[PDB]
């Protein structure tokens, strides 16, 4: 509003719009929908009736994140501006305290700042007195349910008044939410509409990608060979191999069916070809191009593959000495949780069961003057280093002997990474 | 006498042989004489009265005339 | 361990209990009760005379004393002392110790307003309670000796008055000569409450009153298992008509075999059994109106997948013939 | 075709006949009967009394009887403030609305001596408020005491969901005291009083408002677990737009959303045969009925796959993604449960909605999980 | 586990050898054949066994999994899988349907 005038600055020194820059502009998650096409009507025809008849209803939609329920209901109200209402995005997680949404509503009727207490008095005074038109989105309803359900009873008791000019639209995480957190007295007020949103399917996941790739798929750029700048000296083209786009779809629809996850794995795979193109020619920052299948093979795996195995073999010696002692106790006792003094008891014993040049160094950094150490060198350090790494876990006790230690990653992969 | 045939109708309603909660009149005729109880099914009026006494006890009502809700 | 238990008792409903209880407590030993009440009436001039000496009078004894204190404090003493000093009579401030909602702040806020606000004592209001009463005490050492207030503390071993920060608060009140402290306790370990420090401030004397009263008001806050088998006895009286039938089919085969786990039924066959009488459509429609029996804790489940009712063998046939039928 | 069904979605009840007998002294200006009106939820009971008082106020003599909703208080003061709002006056409010004895001074009227009855809406928020015998039962106790000597008495009409509240009353209060007695209940109307109101709420009748025996069929086969037939007409009003969208049909559409994956669509969730293997791997770890970590499951996954060499052992990171494929369909849920060593530390315990009876059918068709069982 | 008892010892192997010798002695033979050991093992396993008292596209799936266990490539150009299906005995219509079904299953 105000400060966007101050967020603008002047000197913009000719940023290089490369080949893959114009992809990521439309591969931004912003800018009719193919997948939830008919269900857009099922909201809207449920909404169009109450709007043009001055009533008060409730609409309940659920689903996993990434399915458009943040998006679709925005497309409902957007066309409605063409044809009497006040649009508010009452987000649950964007409220600091749960009562703070009450302040917004009384702010968004006349423009007054009153307390959560004093708002809902005048809100209740609004909802049963006004002679005769308010659209409210109650997003992410896991946030506003937590304390004692006294907030959630209000947001549906206002719907019961026949003289209440309000239209509520609830969007939750799960359909189960008025059956495993709320009471039945709320569950009578929630209704039984319950519009379910499933995942996306992999065919439609192809049909959502090309909507971003509408005017740019297999099109042509105008490029100078000196700076790598592309314009919608050569006239090059860039093509997208649709089969790699398909194998992006057949995984994301399989695991999650998430519309952000499908776009972003294409977005991550796009910039892999960006740096390899910049590696071969070096246009910096101041015949026919493509994106291979081998890009989305890596980037999809790049969502999966770890490093704690590679972290463990790149740790210190006494780190790998520590874990090898720790699995030795877990196969000695079979109790998966060993006392800390017994580990210090073991690393002593695992010496005497090159080793002497180790055992000299393992308890003192040379130095005859200051040798004879009980516990090993930097034993507090590696145990602190294994703690904040998340591999280990150690309960809090002022005794430094009988404080228990519990593993936090799978002990077999600890056994397996130890073998290297 | 109707409890055993009601349990038979319920266990045949448990699968997708009716494909819904409802069932057709052809499947109604297919599940009275082709099934296990022989000569337990009398005239049309008494089994229509049996469907009516299942209906007021909320078991099997009568609707749309091509299927039976 | 074959033990006879309170579950195996002929139980009594709410209106049946309290009415016949009211018959006994107003007609059992009526003649000797007022016959005691006339005997102890002659002690009333003796209490009046000793109470001029600022003595904290304490009444022990079996039975409730609540009726006796209110006759002795209100009607007898409080106008008798006003007539003997020479106009409204002496203000009586009772303290219901059997009421657990007594605090130290609220009753003392009454006290300083019951006592004289001759100075700005709200200036010393800043825990200043012992501070504010100390400024009350030394001023009262140099005043003309006359009672202006008599307070009554019923059931001094009560659930809130027996708290230790409240007890010491009353201790400093009793050393003042202007107020007479007539209280009663009922506990058998009541003299565990006071040391020689407090009784120095108290100078208690003792008298027996045993009228074997029923303690009508003092029974109300108290509870036993008379006051669940009786809890879910009322929810079934207001539900759907189908839940009665699906509990009837539940209660039959769960009592076909105390009502323990072993008499219970598996979930699959019970779904098929309540599918047999055209009642349960499937598992979800069964379980959802079975969560309503779960939400009001009217049935249990342990592991066959055994759902069993936690009421006794005698209780379920009582639930059979009365409310289900 | 819209305007006939645009109007579709919107003395009258056979329960109002009860309460005029229960308010038999409310037109003779005397103290009426003793009103504690309860109900199972959803039964219209909030708007039921609201129907009566709005028909009372539109009918009715000086006219001032007020009703306030006990939702956002947790404390018995401002109710006695809101009865003052029908006066439109000004006073010292704080002390008069706080103590039991302070309410008694408030009950001397001014203009024409019409008696006042209060209506306490949604009393169960204060019943199911803070701890019982300390504040809330005392709050219940203090309100129901009507021992006032003139007939101007604050007659209560309070409402509650769950019917435990009467046994919660003390034995003195259950000795025929105040408004507790007439425990007027409302059994949920099956179809025999609620559907007929829908008939009279079809005063403006379109031609095709559907075969009404199917509406009777709708009423009979919803009355298993229900209380609000206009809201269960609001599920007919959604299906009446289905016949507008296509230019108990919908209850059939909504139950197949809920019943399936155990019988049929379990194999829909596990098109991967390894997803069938990893699903049995979870249940084999459920022998040690513990906090079923993603690691202890991975422990039993490796130590079995080294015995039977059905596949190579995969990654833990792969094991993370594959169990989330099991998650989004709705089979297994993951929660961050409790372990209390250093802080509130969150290891992930799973839980499966399948039984071994619904397991053994779908594994005998595949003899590659038969080594694993 | 739960239904387990004992372990395999060399004395049980010697007893199996002795029972095979007794079975050969009952047949009055100078040699021990393969028929005695398979009877003795069946005898010692049924001595403890009283305590318990198609593949239309699955064969193609095991062939595809054998090729996936030797190299592990889910390509779109099948030149060896089609040859082992042609020499395995069945037709190519079931092969094309299996390819379409597992591409729909995304393997
Ligand atoms: N059908 C679609 N057509 C076009 N863009 C889409 C579509 N579905 C999702 N998107 C895009 O992907 C983003 C995903 O956000 P949404 O799925 O709307 O949020 P969500 O499903 O509510 O997940 P939340 O908000 O965390 S519960 C949207 O903001 C759009 O930018
Ligand atoms: N018999 C009826 N006559 C008129 N309107 C009715 C009737 N039954 C239900 N309704 C309407 O449908 C609504 C459904 O009741 P609910 O308000 O959801 O439940 P309730 O009124 O809160 O009672 P509770 O749940 O015990 S607080 C009522 O509030 C009325 O608007
Ligand atoms: Mg919302």
Radius of gyration (C-alpha) of chain B in whole angstroms: 11
Residue in the structure block whose two tokens are 């069929």: D217
A255 → chain E, closest CA residue: E106
Task: Name the H helices within A54-149.
Answer: 69-80, 101-107, 116-127
Using DSSP's 3-state secondary structure scheme, residue E85 falls into helix
Beta-carbon neighbour count of residue C180 at 10 Å?
28
- The answer to whether residues D156 and C229 touch, using CB atoms and an 8 Å cutoff, is no
Contacts of D9 in chain A (CB under 8 A): 49-50, 53, 55
Residue D323's nearest CA partner among D346, D293, D343 is D293
Question: What is the distance between the alpha carbons of residues C248 and D30, in angstroms, rounded to a whole number?
Answer: 46
Torsional sign, CA D214, D218, D219, D223: positive
Question: What is the distance between the alpha carbons of residues D304 and E4, in angstroms, rounded to a whole number?
Answer: 18
- The answer to whether residues B54 and B13 touch, using CB atoms and an 8 Å cutoff, is no
> Going by DSSP bridges, is the β-strand pair A337-339/C205-208 parallel, antiparallel, or unpaired?
unpaired
Residue E45's nearest CA partner among E11, E21, E22, E16 is E16
Question: What is the distance between the alpha carbons of residues C283 and C275, in angstroms, rounded to a whole number?
Answer: 10
Contacts of A396 in chain D (CB under 8 A): 341-342
Q: What H or E segment, with its residue span, contains residue C300?
A: strand C300-302
Locate the DSSP E strands across A43-196. 58-62, 87-91, 135-139, 167-171, 195-196
Is E68 part of the contact surface with chain D (CB cutoff 8 Å)?
no
Q: Kindly report the backbone phi and psi dihedral angles of residue C92, in degrees, each rounded to the nearest multiple of 5, phi listed first.
A: -100, 120
Q: Which of residues 80-99 of E touch A (CB under 8 A)?
A: none
Query: Residue E27, annotated ligand binder?
Result: no
Q: Which of B10, B21, B58 sits opposite C275 (nearest CB)?
A: B10
Question: What is the distance between the alpha carbons of residues A157 and A146, in angstroms, rounded to a whole number?
Answer: 18
Using DSSP's 3-state secondary structure scheme, residue A226 falls into coil
Residue with CA at minimum distance from ligand 2 atom 10: D44
Using DSSP's 3-state secondary structure scheme, residue A338 falls into strand
- The answer to whether residues D71 and A153 touch, using CB atoms and an 8 Å cutoff, is yes
Residue D113's nearest CA partner among D219, D182, D29 is D29
- Range C112-117, long-range pairs (CB < 8 A, 24+ positions): C112/C136, C114/C149, C115/C148, C115/C149
Binding site of A, by residue number, is: 63-71, 139-140, 173, 260, 282-286
Helix axes A259-281, A293-302, angle to 10 degrees: 120
Distances (CA, A) of D342 to A392, A393, A396, D33, D338: 12, 8, 5, 62, 11
Residue E20's nearest CA partner among E8, E42, E35 is E35
Query: Residue D40, annotated ligand binder?
Result: yes
Helix axes C164-174, C129-140, angle to 10 degrees: 10
Residue with CA at minimum distance from ligand 1 atom 29: A71
Report residue B46 as tokens.
């008494």
Beta-carbon neighbour count of residue D323 at 10 Å?
21
How far, rounded to the nearest angstrom, does the alpha carbon of residue C259 sit from its chain's CA centroid? 33
Report residue D25 as tokens.
């002294």
Q: What H or E segment, with its residue span, contains residue A247?
A: helix A242-255
Q: Could you tell me if residue C61 is left (phi over 0), alpha (psi between -120 and 50 degrees) or otherwise beta?
A: left
- The answer to whether residues D121 and D84 touch, using CB atoms and an 8 Å cutoff, is no
Contact D271 E106 (CB under 8 A): yes
How far, rounded to the nearest angstrom, does the alpha carbon of residue C232 sit from its chain's CA centroid? 24
Report residue D315 as tokens.
């990654």
Name A227's Cβ contacts closer than 8 Å, sequence gap at least 6.
A16, A283, A286
Locate the DSSP E strands across A183-269. 195-196, 220-223, 230-231, 234-237
Q: Kindly report the backbone phi and psi dihedral angles of residue A137, in degrees, each rounded to the nearest multiple of 5, phi listed first.
A: -110, 115
User: Resolution in angstroms, to 1 decimal, for this deposition?
Assistant: 10.0
Radius of gyration (C-alpha) of chain D in whole angstroms: 31
Helices (H) and strands (E) in chain E, counts: 5, 0
Question: What is the distance between the alpha carbons of residues C97 and C153, in angstroms, rounded to a whole number?
Answer: 6
Q: What H or E segment, with its residue span, contains residue A337?
A: strand A337-339
Using DSSP's 3-state secondary structure scheme, residue E20 falls into helix
Q: Could you tell me if residue A367 is left (phi over 0), alpha (psi between -120 and 50 degrees) or otherwise beta?
A: left
Locate the DSSP E strands across chain D. 36-37, 67-69, 119-121, 183-184, 332-339, 345-352
**B16: DSSP letter:** S
Question: What is the distance between the alpha carbons of residues A170 and A160, in angstroms, rounded to a whole number?
Answer: 15
Residue C248's nearest CA partner among C317, C182, C199, C320 is C320
The DSSP-derived string for D91-130 is --HHHHTTSHHHHHTT----SS----B-EEE-THHHHTSS
Is E50 part of the contact surface with chain D (CB cutoff 8 Å)?
no
Helix axes E34-46, E10-26, angle to 10 degrees: 120
Contacts of C275 in chain B (CB under 8 A): 7, 10-11, 14
Radius of gyration (C-alpha) of chain E in whole angstroms: 24
As a whole number of angstroms, the longest Cα–Cα distance in chain A is 94
> Going by DSSP bridges, is the β-strand pair C92-96/C149-154 parallel, antiparallel, or unpaired?
parallel
> Going by DSSP bridges, is the β-strand pair A230-231/A220-223 parallel, antiparallel, or unpaired?
antiparallel
**Could you tell me which chains touch chain D, where touching means 3 or more CB pairs under 8 A?**
A, B, C, E
Report residue D268 as tokens.
């829909």
Contacts of C281 in chain B (CB under 8 A): 21
Mutate to test the pocket of ligand 1, among A29, A71, A265 (most ligand atoms within 8 A of CB): A71
- The answer to whether residues C60 and C208 touch, using CB atoms and an 8 Å cutoff, is yes
Residue C65's nearest CA partner among C182, C181, C162, C209 is C209
The DSSP-derived string for B17-68 is SSSSS--BHHHHHHTTSSSS--S----HHHHHHHHHHHHTTTS----SSSB-
Q: What H or E segment, with its residue span, contains residue C180?
A: strand C179-184
Locate the DSSP E strands across A118-275. 135-139, 167-171, 195-196, 220-223, 230-231, 234-237
Question: What is the distance between the alpha carbons of residues E74 and A20, in angstroms, rounded to a whole number?
Answer: 28
Task: Name the H helices within chain C.
Answer: 14-24, 30-39, 44-50, 66-70, 78-85, 104-114, 121-124, 129-140, 164-174, 196-202, 241-253, 267-276, 283-295, 313-319
Burial (CB count within 10 angstroms: exposed 0-12, middle 13-18, buried 19+), residue A200: buried
Q: Which of D190, D225, D356, D360 to mutate to test the interface with C (most CBs of C within 10 A)?
A: D225
Question: What is the distance between the alpha carbons of residues C271 and C284, in angstroms, rounded to a whole number?
Answer: 10
Distances (CA, A) of A341 to A403, C244, D370: 8, 63, 45
Question: What is the distance between the alpha carbons of residues A184 and A253, in angstroms, rounded to a whole number?
Answer: 35
Torsional sign, CA C278, C281, C282, C285: negative
Contact C239 D188 (CB under 8 A): yes
Report residue E11 as tokens.
């004395």
Is A342 part of the contact surface with chain D (CB cutoff 8 Å)?
no
Task: Name the H helices within A282-389.
Answer: 293-302, 308-313, 317-332, 340-352, 355-361, 379-388
Using DSSP's 3-state secondary structure scheme, residue C52 falls into helix
Mutate to test the pocket of ligand 2, among A56, A154, A160, A185 (most ligand atoms within 8 A of CB): A160
Question: What is the distance between the alpha carbons of residues D300 and A135, in angstroms, rounded to a whole number?
Answer: 52
Mutate to test the pocket of ligand 2, among D9, D43, D44, D128 (most ligand atoms within 8 A of CB): D44
- The answer to whether residues C53 and C180 touch, using CB atoms and an 8 Å cutoff, is no
Q: What H or E segment, with its residue span, contains residue A262?
A: helix A259-281
The contact set of D with A (CB < 8 A) is 6-7, 9-10, 41-42, 46-47, 69, 71-72, 125, 161, 227-228, 231-232, 234-235, 237-238, 241, 244-245, 254, 257, 295-296, 298-299, 302-303, 315-318, 320-321, 324-325, 328, 339, 341-342, 345
Contacts of B57 in chain C (CB under 8 A): 278
Instruction: Give A68 Cα–ligand 1 centroid separation in angstroms.
Output: 4
Q: How far is D364 from chain E (nearest CA, A)?
A: 13
Q: How far is D60 from chain A (nearest CA, A)?
A: 20
**C91: DSSP letter:** P
Question: What is the distance between the alpha carbons of residues C297 and D242, in angstroms, rounded to a whole number?
Answer: 40
Q: To the nearest 10°, the Cα dihedral for D321, D325, D328, D330?
A: -130
D170 → chain C, closest CA residue: C220
> Going by DSSP bridges, is the β-strand pair C306-308/C265-266 parallel, antiparallel, or unpaired?
antiparallel
Q: To the nearest 10°, the Cα dihedral for A60, A64, A68, A70?
A: 60
Distances (CA, A) of D187 to A384, C242, D190: 65, 13, 9
């Amino acid at each position: 509003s105000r400060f966007e005038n101050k967020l603008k600055t002047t000197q913009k020194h000719q940023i290089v719009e490369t080949i893959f820059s114009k992809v990521k502009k439309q591969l931004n998650s912003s800018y009719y929908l193919p997948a939830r096409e008919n269900e857009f009507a099922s909201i809207y025809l449920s909404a169009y009736s109450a709007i043009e008849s001055d009533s008060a209803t409730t609409i309940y939609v659920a689903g996993t994140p990434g399915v458009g329920k943040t998006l679709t209901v925005r497309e409902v109200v957007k066309e409605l501006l063409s044809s009497d209402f006040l649009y508010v995005e009452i987000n649950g997680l964007k409220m600091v305290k749960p009562t703070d949404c009450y302040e917004t509503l009384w702010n968004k009727v006349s423009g007054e700042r009153l307390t959560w207490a004093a708002s809902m008095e005048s809100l209740e005074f609004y909802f049963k007195r006004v002679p005769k038109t308010i659209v409210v989105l109650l997003d992410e309803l896991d946030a506003m349910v937590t304390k004692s359900q006294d907030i959630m009873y209000n947001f549906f008791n206002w719907t019961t008044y026949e003289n209440a000019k309000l239209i509520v639209i609830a969007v939750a995480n799960t359909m189960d939410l008025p059956e495993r957190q709320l009471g039945n007295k709320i569950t009578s007020r929630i209704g039984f509409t319950r519009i379910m949103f499933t995942g996306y399917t992999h065919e439609e996941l192809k049909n959502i990608i090309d909507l971003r790739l509408k005017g740019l798929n297999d099109s042509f750029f105008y490029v100078d060979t000196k700076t790598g700048n592309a314009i919608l000296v050569r006239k090059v083209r860039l093509r997208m191999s649709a089969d790699a786009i398909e194998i992006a779809s057949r995984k994301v629809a399989s695991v999650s069916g998430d519309a952000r996850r499908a776009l972003k794995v294409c977005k991550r795979a796009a910039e892999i070809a960006e740096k390899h193109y910049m590696a071969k020619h070096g246009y910096g920052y101041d015949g026919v191009q493509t994106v291979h299948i081998t890009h989305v093979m890596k980037a999809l795996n790049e969502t999966l593959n770890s490093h704690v195995i590679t972290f463990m073999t790149r740790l210190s010696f006494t780190a790998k000495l520590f874990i090898y002692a720790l699995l030795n106790l877990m196969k000695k006792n079979g109790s998966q949780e060993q006392e800390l003094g017994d580990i210090v008891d073991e690393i002593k014993l695992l010496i005497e069961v090159f080793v002497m040049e180790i055992a000299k160094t393992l308890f003192q950094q040379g130095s005859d003057n200051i040798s004879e150490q009980l516990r090993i060198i930097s034993w507090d350090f590696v145990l602190n280093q294994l703690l904040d790494a998340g591999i280990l876990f150690k309960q809090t006790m002022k005794n430094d002997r009988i404080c228990c230690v519990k593993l936090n990653i799978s002990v077999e992969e600890a056994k397996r990474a130890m073998n290297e | 006498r109707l409890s055993l045939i009601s349990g038979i109708i319920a266990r045949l309603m448990q699968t997708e042989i009716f494909e819904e909660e409802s069932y057709p009149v052809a499947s109604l005729f297919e599940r009275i004489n082709e099934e296990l109880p022989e000569e337990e099914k009398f005239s049309a009026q008494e089994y229509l009265a049996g469907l009516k006494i299942m209906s007021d006890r909320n078991n099997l009502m009568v609707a749309d005339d091509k299927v039976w809700r | 361990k074959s033990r006879h238990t309170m579950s195996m008792a002929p139980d009594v409903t709410r209106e049946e209990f309290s009415l016949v209880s009211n018959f006994f407590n107003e007609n059992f030993q009526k003649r000797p009760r007022q016959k005691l009440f006339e005997i102890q009436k002659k002690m009333f001039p003796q209490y009046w005379f000793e109470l001029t000496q600022g003595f904290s009078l304490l009444f022990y004894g079996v039975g409730s004393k609540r009726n006796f204190l209110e006759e002795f404090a209100i009607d007898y003493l409080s106008p008798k002392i006003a007539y003997s000093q020479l106009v409204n009579s002496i203000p009586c401030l009772i303290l219901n110790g059997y009421n657990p909602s007594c605090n130290y702040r609220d009753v003392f806020k009454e006290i300083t307003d019951l006592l004289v606000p001759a100075e700005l004592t709200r200036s010393e209001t800043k825990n200043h309670v012992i501070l504010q009463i100390q400024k009350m005490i030394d001023f009262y050492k140099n005043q003309p000796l006359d009672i202006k207030l008599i307070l009554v503390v019923h059931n001094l071993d009560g659930p809130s008055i027996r708290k230790n920060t409240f007890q010491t608060m009353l201790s400093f009140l009793s050393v003042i000569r202007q107020i007479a402290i007539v209280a009663s306790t009922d506990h058998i370990y009541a003299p565990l409450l006071w040391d020689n420090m407090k009784a120095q401030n108290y100078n208690f004397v003792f008298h027996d009153i045993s009228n074997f009263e029923p303690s009508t008001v003092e029974s109300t806050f108290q509870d036993v298992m008379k006051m669940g088998a009786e809890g879910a006895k009322y929810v079934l009286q207001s539900l759907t008509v189908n839940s009665k039938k699906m509990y009837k089919l539940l209660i039959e085969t769960q009592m076909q075999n105390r009502g323990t786990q072993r008499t219970g039924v598996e979930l699959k066959l019970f779904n098929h059994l309540c599918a047999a009488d055209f009642i349960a459509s499937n598992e979800i429609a069964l379980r959802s109106m079975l969560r309503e029996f779960i939400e009001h804790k009217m049935a249990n489940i342990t592991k066959m997948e055994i759902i069993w009712v936690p009421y006794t063998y005698a209780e379920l046939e009582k639930l059979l013939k009365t409310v289900l039928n | 075709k819209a305007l006939l069904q645009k109007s579709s979605e919107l003395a009258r009840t056979a329960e109002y006949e009860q309460v005029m007998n229960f308010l038999a002294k409310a037109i003779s200006e005397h103290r009426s009967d003793s009103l504690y009106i309860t109900g199972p939820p959803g039964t219209g009971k909030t708007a039921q009394l609201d129907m009566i008082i709005r028909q009372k106020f539109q009918s009715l003599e000086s006219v001032a009887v007020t009703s306030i909703n006990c939702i956002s208080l947790g404390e018995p003061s401002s109710i006695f403030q809101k009865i003052f709002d029908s006066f439109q006056d000004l006073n010292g409010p704080t002390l008069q609305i706080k103590n039991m004895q302070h309410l008694q001074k408030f009950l001397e009227p001014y203009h024409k001596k019409t008696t006042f009855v209060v209506v306490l809406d949604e009393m169960d928020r204060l019943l199911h408020a803070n701890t019982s015998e300390t504040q809330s039962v005392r709050t219940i106790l203090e309100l129901f005491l009507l021992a006032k000597l003139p007939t101007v008495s604050f007659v209560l009409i309070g409402m509650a969901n769950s019917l435990d509240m009467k046994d919660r009353f003390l034995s003195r209060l259950n000795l025929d005291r105040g408004l507790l007695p007439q425990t007027i209940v409302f059994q949920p109307y099956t179809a025999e009083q609620m559907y007929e109101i829908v008939i009279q709420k079809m005063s403006s009748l379109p031609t095709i408002i559907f075969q009404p025996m199917a509406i009777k069929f709708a009423a009979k086969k919803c009355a298993g677990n229900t209380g609000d037939l206009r809201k269960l007409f609001d599920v007919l009003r959604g299906s009446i737009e289905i016949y507008e969208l296509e230019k108990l049909n919908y209850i059939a559409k909504v139950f197949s959303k809920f019943v399936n994956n155990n019988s049929t669509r379990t194999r829909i969730a596990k098109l991967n045969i390894q997803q069938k293997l990893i699903l049995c791997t979870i249940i084999q770890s459920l022998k040690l009925n513990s906090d079923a970590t993603i690691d202890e499951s991975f422990d039993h996954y490796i130590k079995a796959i080294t015995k039977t060499d059905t596949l190579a052992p995969l990654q833990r990171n792969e094991f993370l993604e594959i169990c989330t494929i099991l998650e989004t369909c709705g089979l297994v849920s993951i929660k961050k449960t409790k372990c209390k060593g250093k802080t509130k530390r969150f290891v992930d315990k799973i839980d499966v909605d399948l039984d071994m009876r619904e397991f053994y059918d779908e594994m005998t068709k595949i003899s590659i999980l038969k080594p694993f069982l | 586990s739960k239904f387990s008892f004992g372990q395999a010892t060399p004395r049980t192997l010697l007893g199996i050898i002795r029972l095979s010798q007794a079975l050969a002695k009952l047949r009055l033979a100078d040699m021990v054949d393969i028929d005695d050991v398979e009877e003795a093992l069946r005898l010692v396993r049924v001595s403890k066994e009283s305590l318990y008292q198609e593949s239309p596209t699955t064969k193609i799936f095991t062939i595809i999994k054998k090729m996936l266990q030797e190299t592990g490539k889910n390509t779109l150009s099948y030149e060896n899988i089609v040859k082992t299906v042609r020499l395995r005995g069945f037709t190519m219509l079931q092969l094309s349907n299996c390819i379409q079904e597992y591409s729909y299953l995304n393997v």
